[PDB]
Design a protein around this ligand. Structure first.
Ligand code: YDJ
Length: 254
């Protein structure tokens, strides 16, 4: 059926192989996991959008799952972020538009990803950004009724502060915050804090508006002003995606 040509990634999660069709030479990605995966499959089956990694199907051979996925030859966004520099501002803006499109799509169908970070955003052959790895994703809305979440999911530098502080919390502002951290990384090549908490010096400095320090001094006033609306501790005063779409920098031709 498919020839496994090479490893695209490996981790405790499992591995990702580039597979090439024996007859047609079509290339796809195959995520292989040795048995959570049932849910990842379930969620993947719900998705159809240009800014999400497309799911083609799956096959279970014993205890091993093979998920057939759209091959994104551009790799992880993470490898486009030059350490302590980031990337040109216009590329950052374009990737952010595309990230927003994907997140808007997921939220529209009541799905929250919960693990948004540059390692889980892939780039296709035309450098279009695609949301990847739905292994922590879940439903937060059923028939116009929202459920608040309580699970400790994600990676600390990207997680919203309410995740640590509150007994439960709305899904959407958590994904928005992580998108702001990804935006900061893209602009400055630097994560702003290890943990979103007052005991982290870099976090308090941000709340004390010390943007003369890194990474904020590397960032132009315009996108910086977007980041002040996104990286807001109180999730109820945090900017929503409909209002992100109205931000001056977001709409600035670059
Ligand atoms: N779908 C697809 O092409 N996948 C895909 C393709 C990748 C890739 C593409 C080109 C060059 C290269 F070195 C890697 S990496 C990757 C992937 O899904 N990695 C995961 C591992 C777990 C952490 N999140 C990213």
């Amino acid at each position: 059926d498919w020839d496994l040509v090479q490893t695209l990634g490996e981790g405790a999660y499992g591995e990702v192989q580039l597979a090439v069709n024996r007859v047609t030479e079509e290339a796809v990605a195959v995520k292989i996991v040795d048995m959570n995966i049932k849910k990842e499959i379930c969620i993947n089956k719900m998705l159809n959008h240009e800014n999400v990694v497309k799911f083609y199907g799956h096959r279970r051979e014993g205890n091993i799952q093979y998920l057939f996925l759209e091959y994104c030859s551009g790799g992880e966004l993470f490898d486009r972020i030059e350490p302590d520099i980031g990337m040109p501002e216009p590329d950052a803006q374009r990737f952010f538009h595309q990230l927003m499109a994907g997140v808007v799509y997921l939220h529209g169908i009541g799905i929250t990803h919960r693990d948004i970070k540059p390692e889980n955003l892939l780039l296709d052959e035309r450098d279009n950004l695609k949301i990847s790895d739905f292994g922590l994703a879940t439903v937060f809305r059923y028939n116009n009724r929202e459920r608040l979440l309580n699970k400790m999911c994600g990676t600390l530098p990207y997680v919203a502060p309410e995740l640590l502080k509150r007994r439960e919390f709305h899904a959407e502002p958590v994904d928005v915050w992580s998108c702001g951290i990804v935006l900061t990384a893209m602009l400055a090549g630097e994560l702003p804090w290890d943990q979103p908490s007052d005991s982290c010096q870099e976090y308090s400095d941000w709340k004390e508006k010390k943007t003369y320090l890194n990474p904020w001094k590397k960032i132009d006033s315009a996108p910086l002003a977007l980041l002040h609306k996104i990286l807001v501790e109180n999730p109820s005063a945090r900017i929503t995606i409909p209002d992100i779409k109205k931000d001056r920098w977001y709409n600035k031709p670059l």
